[PDB]
Design a protein around this ligand. Structure first.
Ligand SMILES: [Mg+2]
Ligand SMILES: [Mg+2]
Ligand SMILES: [Mg+2]
Ligand SMILES: [Mg+2]
Ligand SMILES: [Mg+2]
Ligand SMILES: [Mg+2]
Ligand SMILES: [Mg+2]
Ligand SMILES: [Mg+2]
Ligand SMILES: [Mg+2]
Ligand SMILES: [Mg+2]
Ligand SMILES: [Mg+2]
Ligand SMILES: [Mg+2]
Ligand SMILES: [Mg+2]
Ligand SMILES: [Mg+2]
Ligand SMILES: [Mg+2]
Ligand SMILES: [Mg+2]
Ligand SMILES: [Mg+2]
Ligand SMILES: [Mg+2]
Ligand SMILES: [Mg+2]
Lengths: 57, 78, 53, 96, 107
RNA sequence: ACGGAAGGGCACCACCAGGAGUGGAGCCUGCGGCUUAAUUUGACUCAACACGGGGAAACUCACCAGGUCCAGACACAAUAAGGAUUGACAGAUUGAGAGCUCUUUCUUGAUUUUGUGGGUGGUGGUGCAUGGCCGUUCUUAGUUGGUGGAGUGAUUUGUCUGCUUAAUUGCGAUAACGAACGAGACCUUAACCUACUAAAUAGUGGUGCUAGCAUUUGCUGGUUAUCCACUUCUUAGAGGGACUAUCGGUUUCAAGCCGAUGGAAGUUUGAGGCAAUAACAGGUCUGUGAUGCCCUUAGACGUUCUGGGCCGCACGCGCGCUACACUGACGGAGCCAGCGAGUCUAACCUUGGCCGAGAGGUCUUGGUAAUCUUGUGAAACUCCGUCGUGCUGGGGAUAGAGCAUUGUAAUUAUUGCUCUUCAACGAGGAAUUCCUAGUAAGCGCAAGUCAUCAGCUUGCGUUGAUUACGUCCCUGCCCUUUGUACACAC
């Protein structure tokens, strides 16, 4: 009754030697707990914004 | 704290009854007999009438400051 | 994370209980005793309530 | 079921800080006096302590008096990472 | 500070008339040989707190009732005394079972 | 112990003389039955049935239809940090803005999960396993032993024929004598105190100071370093007071009883509180974190949330409210209690002003209280009117429409108010209850319950009878003699 907790490695971060610099799109925003979140269907899961969250991507 | 004398003296009796039952349950092996409450200005003193006044006072004051801490913590005493 | 766990208990029987046994029935509220009738009988002497007449 | 480690720490440190806890038998109270956590949390944390020892429990009119034990002081001081026997925790503190 | 009138009222409340009248006697005497102008101890009507209960913990039986009583006795004394000495004599020796309230008036 | 055996007693939970009734009506309320998803239960003569403080909208709650949660300690074996576990927006789903569960992908981090033991909780069972408490026998007057006497003994006497008392209370009789418990004493309360102590939180008289009158002092409003005095009334401490006193009668001339006088008081001065021994398979496990044992413990009998039921209506019974009218209803006016309770330890008791027919609303006020609500200006009652013997201007059930208040929520109408509807009921059968003086009865008020709700209870005062001061006829209980094949005791 939970996520399978599969051996998930780092996601949304492609490589470090990707011909040849580090390639991590979605430049660091004010959401540090940067970090990658859930997209369900044109939505994002509010994870750190306890007060205000006005952004859509 | 701005209470009528009626409700104040009733609360004082209820305070005594609860103290008595608490000491009855805690001070069993200590031979607890009864309790007395003298309310003086700036201090309320609770006299515990017990048979063996040694174990109730523990060693160097054990089980008597434990009781003082418990009583002030339940009844909100500074 | 639990909004379904509490319904109003501000007035009425369920809002009060005996300070001795936590019973909602036979509760004596005069002068703020908040003790049920049975426990009051067993504890009236050391509250200060006595039988005279 | 569960209990956050921060709340369990802030109850254990409170217990060790004076040796006693008083908790009204009222689950759902959502705020113990002078402990920044749930009343249910303090009752169950101290119950877990009591079952393995470490604590004496008395009820007395719906109020859950809790006392530290001489063998539970050692467990709490190892738990809270305090200097060994330097702080009694904190019974024999001032008057002596 | 030096022989100044205070307009004090000492209100004595208790459930035990004997000790209540001992404290009242002590106050009146300490006013007497200290040469005060005092309004004698006024005795307010006794308050009888009545609680009427059924005797049976269940409901069976003849319907027998009990009336438990608590008696509250109230007195008060008015004094015109220097504050320091009467404070020293009345802060001390507070007998148990008697609640003492000392209040200053601007009358 | 019992007796459809004899005798003696006692008692308005018996009767006599009577009073008020109840039983008949309509409503209220409890109980059985019926109904039901559930209509949760316990109690069934006194000694169940306005009882469980049981006036349940939710809660209470124990039941029914459902939905969550774990608040399953602790120990052991596994599960995990290549993550044991936790929580969620949105939608589906759901009564539900319960991430309950799914879809989804985020979050969290030996706090937990699974199993085994073991715990915990339970208004689940068992009151015929118990404790405590309560009720009942019985608030009756009874119970017990030491020494002595009787008897092999179990046992018996004392502890009794009589008289007397409320009392095994006494006077007496006496193989018993002297004692203890119970009764009494005691305690609380009610009544008296011009005698004591005192009071701006009680009251009164003067008046420093006034002041308003009608008048020339009658009625009153105001201030206590904007006064003096006092304690009769009130309060409450300490005391006093009654001991059935005095006198007469009567008694075995004793215990006592009766009458008169006096007295605040002469029914144990009134009423209560406490209250022995031995018991009851009396009630309560549904008051208790009192409790043995049994049951259950994660799809729970734990706990919570939503909804419903507890109130359901061919009917049978109990406690009651309102009545059947003129000893009244209605309108106006007069107009008088005592016992209480009450908020800053949060909205309690509410004056006054204003608004509104009303219920109520609104702005302030005082009171943690002998202070303020509150002189609780209560109702019955009194007077003057209207009505006029007509189910009538008696009665107010049932029902309609509307305005409010409490509360999250008022539908199965919470309650209140207004207008309308205007039933039975013409004094109640067999039967049956309570009661002897400030009592019965009538009348309300406060308190408990309580957010709201009393037709209930616990108290309080207001008005205030008639009848008898007795008997053993009925009922019940106790005692003596007696009979017994009863002792699980008719
Ligand atoms: Mg008759
Ligand atoms: Mg009738
Ligand atoms: Mg009838
Ligand atoms: Mg329910
Ligand atoms: Mg003998
Ligand atoms: Mg005998
Ligand atoms: Mg006796
Ligand atoms: Mg007596
Ligand atoms: Mg006087
Ligand atoms: Mg029984
Ligand atoms: Mg019912
Ligand atoms: Mg009055
Ligand atoms: Mg008519
Ligand atoms: Mg009419
Ligand atoms: Mg009308
Ligand atoms: Mg109701
Ligand atoms: Mg009732
Ligand atoms: Mg009869
Ligand atoms: Mg024969």
């Amino acid at each position: 009754h939970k996520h399978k907790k599969v051996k998930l490695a780092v996601l949304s971060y492609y490589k470090v030697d990707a011909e040849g610099k580090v390639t991590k799109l979605r430049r660091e925003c004010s959401n540090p707990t940067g970090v990658f979140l859930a997209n369900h269907k044109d939505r994002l899961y509010c994870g750190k914004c306890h007060s205000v969250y006005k952004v859509n991507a | 704290a701005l209470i009528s004398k009626k409700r104040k003296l009733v609360a004082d009796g209820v305070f005594y009854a609860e103290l008595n039952e608490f000491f009855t349950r805690e001070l069993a092996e200590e031979g607890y007999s009864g309790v007395e409450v003298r309310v003086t200005p700036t201090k309320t003193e609770v006299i515990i009438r017990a048979t063996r006044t040694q174990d109730v006072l523990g060693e160097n004051g054990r089980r008597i400051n434990e009781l003082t801490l418990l009583v002030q913590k339940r009844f909100k005493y500074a | 994370e639990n909004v379904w766990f509490s319904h109003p208990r501000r007035y009425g029987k369920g809002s009060r209980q005996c300070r001795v046994c936590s019973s909602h029935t036979g509760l004596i509220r005069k002068y703020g005793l908040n003790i049920c009738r049975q426990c009051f009988r067993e504890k009236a002497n050391d509250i200060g309530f006595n039988k005279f007449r | 079921m569960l209990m956050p480690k921060e709340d369990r720490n802030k109850i254990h440190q409170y217990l060790f800080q004076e040796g006693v806890v008083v908790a009204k038998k009222d689950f759902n109270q959502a705020k113990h006096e002078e402990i920044d956590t749930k009343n249910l949390y303090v009752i169950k944390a101290l119950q877990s302590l009591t079952s393995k020892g470490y604590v004496k429990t008395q009820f007395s009119w719906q109020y859950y008096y809790y006392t530290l034990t001489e063998e539970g002081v050692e467990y709490l001081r190892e738990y809270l990472n305090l200097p060994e026997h330097i702080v009694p925790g904190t019974y024999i503190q001032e008057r002596n | 500070q030096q022989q100044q009138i205070i307009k004090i009222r000492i209100t004595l409340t208790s459930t035990k008339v004997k000790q209540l009248e001992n404290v009242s006697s002590n106050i009146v005497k300490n006013a007497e040989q200290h040469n005060l102008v005092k309004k004698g101890p006024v005795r307010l009507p006794t308050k009888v707190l009545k609680i009427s209960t059924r005797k049976t913990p269940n409901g069976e039986g003849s319907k027998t009732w009990e009336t438990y009583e608590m008696r509250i006795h109230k007195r008060y004394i008015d004094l015109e005394a220097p504050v320091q000495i009467v404070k020293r004599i009345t802060q001390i020796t507070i007998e148990p079972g008697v609640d003492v309230e000392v209040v200053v008036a601007s009358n």
